[PDB]
């Protein structure tokens, strides 16, 4: 009898270490073994440590702890945790169930209640959106009040991306502007493209931009005011609509019905994914997986290594404008107001049937959803009308 | 039409005007970026307005597209930074060169043409309150040009 | 005194004028020395239009200065 001999000789920490390697069910089973085992689990805050470990290794649990509020007590009679764990599991189950059932709140925007957002990005504090009136609006994530307005772009602000220090936007006036996310003073202006900039991405000090001029430009960002063009990628015969990248490859989707994969190392043409009947409007590349939404009303999933069409998704009655995905689902938005939520785990499996992939079709609005970003708890979208829609699932 | 453009650049690099400066962006000799310094004794005092010039294939016989890059307050310039010089739309002449078009725009910066304007919401205030306009344009200049 | 004016043809010329002549006289001299009617003439100095009904002294134009000649424009 280890659990009883170990603490008998003063090795309580060893016994607790032994019990810490158990899961939820095994832990309750051990708690129901004997009085001494129960005393060890109680005295050692075994349940609390279990919840802490879960929060440390799972995003869903983390998000729930920060949104629901019970995370405040993490990192207290030791009974609150043992009784809280079942409630947390219950909440997670309710979350996934309503995700597959279609429940929401649809919190509207609280400002003058007046439109035309082309790109949107949010966090837990603000919502940055690139309007069509040549301005950038920053809203509050909690009160939804229009916090600030950044002006200075000559044309319409098409795309944008920000981090904890700057806000890089690409407008229709063929210019890229670097703003200060804290204060809002225009820190830099890049004049290198001959036509409207359609998309841009940046991370780890490097950036990539694609404009209607059928060209791609990579930039080395040494500071918000020190950006230098490194190379000019050519090869596309049409307007490059979307461009994404990582440390391995850079994917470019243009209106020429093809996908191009170049090597980030020295901009080397690696592969070319073909199969789309029309131009590609949106795409996301991550974890060596590419998901593209084109004009053929279908969503194509591919493996960056082989470039094989793992699966084509049908059902969209219009052009798939934007699409996003995570480790669990794939949320897509086409012209007709129809937010289609698909399962990713079931899609990556070649044995699943096509009919069992489309989870739900949320239809509450009708305008062309231009942008939509989601996480494990909500979906923020923007279309022609209906300035901003928040799809909360809790 | 590359020889003419090269000669124009040579002239700009030899006899530069008072408040005009235009140079190529990168390797594309057909895409230049110019600058216009706000003329003195005007609401645009001490301001630098960036432009963007794009030369067509038959530039010597076709006006080049010129567009403002920094927002401004003027009855002949909308928010999109589009300019309405009749010498740029139909009355273009092969004699006019970049150093001339930029100077013409600079002159237009001071003397606006309220008659047949591009932004009525501004031309109205100009023809009615020539005082408030002097303050609004100044504020915008301090917000973008400066 | 004397002033310098740059014509549309790229070439440069100079005119012998005093601070008493009117702008109309200046344009007339530019016409006879070049061959362009005054209706299609516009004088710019320090980025400012030169009104016809005035005189060089009204704009504080010293000798050896430079004037740019451009075509006519409108709204």
């Amino acid at each position: 009898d280890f659990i009883t001999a170990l603490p008998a000789r003063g090795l309580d920490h060893i016994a607790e270490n032994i019990l810490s390697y158990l899961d939820a069910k095994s832990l309750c089973a051990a708690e129901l073994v004997c009085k001494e085992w129960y005393r060890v689990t109680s005295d050692g805050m075994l349940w609390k440590k279990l919840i802490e470990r879960m929060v440390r290794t799972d995003s869903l649990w983390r998000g729930l702890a920060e949104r629901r509020g019970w995370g405040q007590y993490l990192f207290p009679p030791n009974s609150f945790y043992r009784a809280l764990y079942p409630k947390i599991i219950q909440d997670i189950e309710t979350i996934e169930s309503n995700w597959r059932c279609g429940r929401h709140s649809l919190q509207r925007i609280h400002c003058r209640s007046e439109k035309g957002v082309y790109c949107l990005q949010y966090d837990d504090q603000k919502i940055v959106s690139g309007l069509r009136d040549n301005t950038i609006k920053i809203w509050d994530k909690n009160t939804l009040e229009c916090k600030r307005i950044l002006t200075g772009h000559t044309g319409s602000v098409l795309c944008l991306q920000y981090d904890e220090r700057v806000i890089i936007t690409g407008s229709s006036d063929s210019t890229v502007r670097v703003w200060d996310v804290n204060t809002g003073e225009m820190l830099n202006t890049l004049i290198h493209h001959c036509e409207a900039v359609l998309h841009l991405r940046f991370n780890n000090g490097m950036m990539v931009t694609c404009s209607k001029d059928r060209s791609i430009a990579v930039w080395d960002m040494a500071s918000p005011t020190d950006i230098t063009l490194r190379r000019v990628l050519v090869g596309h015969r049409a307007a490059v609509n979307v461009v994404d990248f990582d440390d391995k490859y850079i994917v470019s989707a243009s209106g020429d019905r093809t996908i191009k994969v170049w090597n980030t190392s020295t901009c080397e043409f690696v592969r070319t994914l073909n199969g789309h009947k029309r131009g590609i409007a949106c795409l996301q590349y991550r974890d060596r997986l590419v998901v593209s939404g084109s004009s053929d009303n279908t969503i194509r999933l591919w493996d960056i290594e082989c470039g094989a069409c793992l699966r084509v998704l049908e059902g969209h009655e219009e052009l798939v404008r934007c699409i996003r995905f995570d480790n669990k689902r794939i949320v897509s938005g086409a012209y007709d107001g129809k937010i289609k939520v698909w399962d990713l785990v079931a899609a990556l499996d070649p044995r699943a049937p096509a009919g069992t992939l489309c989870l739900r079709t949320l239809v509450e609005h009708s305008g062309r959803v231009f942008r939509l970003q989601f996480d494990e708890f909500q979906i923020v979208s923007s279309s022609h009308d209906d300035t901003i829609l928040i799809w909360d699932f809790l | 039409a590359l020889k003419r453009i090269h000669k124009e650049l040579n002239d700009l690099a030899r006899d530069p005007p008072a408040q005009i400066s235009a140079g190529p962006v990168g390797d594309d000799m057909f895409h230049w970026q110019a600058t216009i310094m706000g003329p003195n004794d005007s609401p645009y005092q001490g301001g630098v307005f960036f432009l963007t010039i794009h030369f067509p294939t038959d530039y010597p016989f076709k006006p080049p597209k010129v567009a403002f890059t920094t927002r401004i307050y003027h009855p002949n310039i909308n928010s999109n930074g589009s300019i309405c010089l009749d010498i740029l739309r139909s009355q273009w002449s092969p004699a006019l060169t970049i150093s001339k078009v930029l100077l013409s725009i600079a002159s237009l910066l001071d003397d606006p043409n309220p008659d047949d304007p591009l932004v009525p919401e501004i031309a109205r205030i100009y023809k009615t309150d020539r005082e408030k306009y002097n303050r609004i344009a100044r504020e915008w200049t301090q917000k973008y040009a400066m | 005194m004397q002033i310098f004016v740059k014509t549309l043809t790229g070439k440069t010329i100079t005119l012998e004028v005093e601070p008493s002549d009117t702008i109309e006289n200046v344009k007339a001299k530019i016409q006879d020395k070049e061959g362009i009617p005054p209706d299609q003439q516009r004088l710019i100095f320090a980025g400012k239009q030169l009104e016809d009904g005035r005189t060089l002294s009204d704009y504080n134009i010293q000798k050896e200065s430079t004037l740019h000649l451009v075509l006519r424009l409108r709204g």
């Binding site: 035309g116 082309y118 790109c119 069509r132 319409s156 098409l158 795309c159 229709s172 409207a196 359609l198 998309h199 609509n241 404008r321 062309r368 231009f370 022609h384 | 002949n76 309405c84 010089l85 009749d86 739309r89 047949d116 591009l118 | 409108r74 709204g75």
Partner: peptide, 9 residues
């Protein structure tokens, strides 16, 4: 001078 799907991207 006088005058002379909204998805640019």
């Amino acid at each position: 001078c006088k005058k002379e799907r909204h998805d640019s991207g």
